[PDB]
């Protein structure tokens, strides 16, 4: 489970 | 449906989750918008939580890894195709 | 060691994995999996955000804490 914040 | 969203270059006020290397969206390799800040740039561009990102400036990310999708979104307006609803 | 890392918001992109509701890092912690190719390093455990504890947070709780309308991160590495 990987998220990215941009 | 499938929508074309124009998104500024990256901040954008969004988080994405998912990818073919494997959350409550879908159910499932897709990359999804998991959160948008209400007045951030992503929200104003018409992106929505739950949107499945299908392509980014012609790059097919329907089966992409999480980091493939992100790189696409961060290459230095973006044209996104999303599936929703 | 544990470091406080200040980042000006306008530095581009942060990827994380982990969380308590649950990679090669670490733990129950939240870990930096990527930084756009400053200060933060892959494998950093994120302990707090703007002084708010996330040591035991869920993945989505971490994300919401990182997704803030300067950003301060307390991290442990190694």
Give the C-alpha distances (Å, rounded to integers) separating C42 from B4, B80, C2, C16, C70: 33, 28, 14, 9, 20
Identify all chain B residues contacting C66, using CB atoms and an 8 Å cutoff.
Answer: 15
Identify all chain B residues contacting A2, using CB atoms and an 8 Å cutoff.
Answer: 17, 19, 21, 66-67
Say how many Å lie between the first and final Cα of chain C, rounded. 7
- Which residues of chain B approach chain C closer than 8 Å at the C-beta? 10-11, 13-15, 17, 23, 34-35, 37, 39-40, 66-67, 70, 74
Are residues B16 and A4, on separate chains, in Cβ contact within 8 Å? yes
Residue partners of B12: CB distance under 8 A and separation at least 6: A6, B40, B41, B42
Q: How far apart are CA B49 and CA C24, in angstroms?
A: 29
| Technique that determined the structure | X-ray
Give the C-alpha distances (Å, rounded to integers) separating B39 from B49, B84, C46, C67: 14, 20, 26, 13
Identify all chain B residues contacting C10, using CB atoms and an 8 Å cutoff.
Answer: 11
Residue partners of B41: CB distance under 8 A and separation at least 6: B7, B8, B11, B12, B13
DSSP codes joined into one string, C14-68:
EEEEE-TT-------SEEEEEE------TTPEEEEETTEE-TT--HHHHHHHHS-
User: CA B37, C56, C49 angle in degrees (round to 5)?
Assistant: 45
Q: How far apart are CA B62 and CA B56, in angstroms?
A: 10
Contact C72, C5 (CB under 8 A): yes
Resolution in Å equals: 2.0
Are residues C17 and A5, on separate chains, in Cβ contact within 8 Å? no
User: CA C8, B16, C5 angle in degrees (round to 5)?
Assistant: 25
Are residues A3 and C15, on separate chains, in Cβ contact within 8 Å? yes
Interfacial B residues in 8-67 facing A (CB < 8 Å): 10-12, 14-17, 19, 21-23, 34, 66-67
What does the CA dihedral B64, B53, B13, C30 come to, rounded to 10 degrees? Answer: -40
Domains and CATH numbers, chain B: 2-83 (2.30.42.10)
Residue B71 DSSP code:
H
Which chains have 3+ CB pairs within 8 A of A? Answer: B, C
């Amino acid at each position: 489970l990987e998220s990215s914040i941009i | 449906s499938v929508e074309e969203i124009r998104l500024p270059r990256a901040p954008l006020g969004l988080s994405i989750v998912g990818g073919s290397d494997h959350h409550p969206f879908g159910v499932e390799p897709g990359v999804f918008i998991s959160k948008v800040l209400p007045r951030g740039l992503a929200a104003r561009s018409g992106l929505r939580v739950g949107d499945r990102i299908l392509a980014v400036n012609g790059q097919d990310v329907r089966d992409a890894t999480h980091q493939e999708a992100v790189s696409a979104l961060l290459r230095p307006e973006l044209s996104l195709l999303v599936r929703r609803d």
